[PDB]
Amino acid sequence: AERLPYDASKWEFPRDRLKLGKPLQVIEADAFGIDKTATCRTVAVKMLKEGATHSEHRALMSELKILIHIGHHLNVVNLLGACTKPGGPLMVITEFCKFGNLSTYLRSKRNEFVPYKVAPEDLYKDFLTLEHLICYSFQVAKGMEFLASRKCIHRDLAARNILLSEKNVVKICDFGLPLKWMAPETIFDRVYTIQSDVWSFGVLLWEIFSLGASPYPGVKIDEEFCRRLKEGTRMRAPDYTTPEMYQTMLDCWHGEPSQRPTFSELVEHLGNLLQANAQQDRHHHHHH
Numbered sequence: 001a002e003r004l005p006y007d008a009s010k011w012e013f014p015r016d017r018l019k020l021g022k023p024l025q026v027i028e029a030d031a032f033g034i035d036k037t038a039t040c041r042t043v044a045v046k047m048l049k050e051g052a053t054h055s056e057h058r059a060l061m062s063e064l065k066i067l068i069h070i071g072h073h074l075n076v077v078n079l080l081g082a083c084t085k086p087g088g089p090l091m092v093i094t095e096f097c098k099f100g101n102l103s104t105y106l107r108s109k110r111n112e113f114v115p116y117k118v119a120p121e122d123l124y125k126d127f128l129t130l131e132h133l134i135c136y137s138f139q140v141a142k143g144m145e146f147l148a149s150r151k152c153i154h155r156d157l158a159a160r161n162i163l164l165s166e167k168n169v170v171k172i173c174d175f176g177l178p179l180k181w182m183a184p185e186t187i188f189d190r191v192y193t194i195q196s197d198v199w200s201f202g203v204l205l206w207e208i209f210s211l212g213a214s215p216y217p218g219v220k221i222d223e224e225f226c227r228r229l230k231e232g233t234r235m236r237a238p239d240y241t242t243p244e245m246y247q248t249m250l251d252c253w254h255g256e257p258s259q260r261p262t263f264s265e266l267v268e269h270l271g272n273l274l275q276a277n278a279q280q281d282r283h284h285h286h287h288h
């Protein structure tokens with residue numbers, strides 16, 4: 001629905017308080033006074049091109065309203081304000097994640113990975129570890145549990161739509177071959193649901209534990225691909241996975257949408273795996 005309310009007094013931001021920067025249309029920019037926390041803050045802006053159809057305007061507006069309605073969550077790009085009143089183009093302003101999409105970031109740390117650290121820890125400064133990977137998965141799962149709980153369906157959950165912020169905090173965003181993230185029922189029936197988002201999460205898991213690889217490596221995405229997918233064929237375990245994570249991937253990819261775990265179960269499961277890994281890490285650190 002678009003019937004959602006827009007509270008101008010709370011969200012409206014003056015267009016001349018922004019200084020548009022480079023493209024990420026989604027642009028990066030400097031916003032002055034959008035925060036009572038400072039005077040100048042870097043932010044991201046999604047705006048309508050100068051052409052923009054009337055229906056295209058209504059679309060960006062509905063996204064804005066949904067962002068307002070949903071609310072704040074540490075693992076979802078948070079809305080900061082908007083320019084909707086007459087005088088300029090419609091603009092939606094959110095926090096900025098300087099490190100970019102998770103896929104690209106993981107791709108750049110392939111030579112900087114160890115399963116876990118021990119002394120001397122300095123030999124692994126800013127390296128990725130199993131803790132990091134499971135932690136990104138845990139956060140995205142909490143973000144999705146947050147959205148599913150509000151009847152909000154992503155429709156394009158993939159590593160490219162996950163942003164990396166400071167302190168290894170990841171956020172779910174939406175820049176809005178994509179068939180590779182789509183569940184069987186989405187491809188053959190054009191059905192989108194929380195469950196089909198669970199399928200996508202599984203593919204995201206694979207991406208995270210392959211360190212930014214492209215799903216279904218060396219496979220043409222044609223009719224055979226879709227046929228085999230519906231028939232039960234699945235990607236093999238990626239290079240940096242743990243046995244439990246791979247099985248969570250298989251669970252997410254179950255043929256029956258209703259047999260896949262819910263995001264609450266995944267949040268619960270990933271949480272336990274995160275603690276087990278951490279406990280294991282303490283022993284590895286202590287003994288060596």
Ligand SMILES: Cc1ccn(-c2ccc3c(c2)NCC3(C)C)c(=O)c1-c1ccc2nc(N)ncc2c1
Pocket residue numbers: 024026044045046063066067076077092093094095096097098099100101152154163172173174175
């Ligand atoms: C500018 C902008 C506006 C709306 N949404 C957006 C759209 C839909 C949704 C969210 C955020 N979050 C929840 C959901 C799926 C409803 C966004 O991700 C972004 C957006 C896009 C790229 C970005 N890139 C960086 N580096 N930093 C912040 C970004 C923010």
